[PDB]
Amino acid sequence: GTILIDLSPDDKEFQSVEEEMQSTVREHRDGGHAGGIFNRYNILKIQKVCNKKLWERYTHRRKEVSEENHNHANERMLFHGSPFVNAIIHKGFDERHAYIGGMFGAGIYFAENSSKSNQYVYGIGGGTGCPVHKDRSCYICHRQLLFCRVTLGKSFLQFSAMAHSPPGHHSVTGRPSVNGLALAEYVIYRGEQAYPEYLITYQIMRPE
Ligand SMILES: Nc1ccc(-c2nc3ccccc3c(=O)[nH]2)cc1
Ligand SMILES: [Zn+2]
DSSP states (O other): OEEEEEETTSSSSHHHHHHHHHTTTOOOOTTTTTTSSSOOOOOOEEEEEEEEHHHHHHHHHHHHHHHHTTTTOOOEEEOOOOTTTHHHHOOOOOOOSSSSTTTTTTTEEESSHHHHHTTTTTTTGGTTOOOOOOOTTSSSSOEEEEEEEEOOOSSEEEEEEEOOOOOSEEEEEEEEOOHHHHOEEEEESSSSGGEEEEEEEEOOOOOO
């Protein structure tokens, strides 16, 4: 049921999604080990992910959460990187997409920093890198991230450097507590609380 609609680079929607991707790059404490060494991306394509059944699954859950949280879904647009991006856009997020060994438990993880999600494109810790060159810093191979609409509801705040949500909460927020430049990361425990709205194809760019 999924169709992918190409956005033109001239379209304001392409430009605003590109700007969120580029402006949320940061340096990582691994010196680039997992995701590569880069300061910016070459955006090759942005596609809108259109699936009516998956969208309605998302909005149904969104209304449930909103009604449990004084009419406030606490909806964000967050990045997701995963070896399973093809399955996610066709089947929806579910338990198979969870980070079993995540620091906040087995849930589905999202990032404000696009470069944090980029660390998971080829697997946990970047796996063995791109399939063609086995290079975690490959500048040649095409990568993909999702930019997703995510319902947080009442989020449990974890200060720090599938399972169930903490009771009375709909998600967990991992607040950066050491690295002052890090943006927040978030975990949901129900696949219905994210919709994979944009599929972004890109390369990391070698700094000059
Ligand atoms: N199997 C697996 C494991 C981890 C991820 C994953 N973790 C994250 C952790 C923190 C912030 C963002 C992400 C992410 O964008 N993706 C995806 C699939
Ligand atoms: Zn490669």
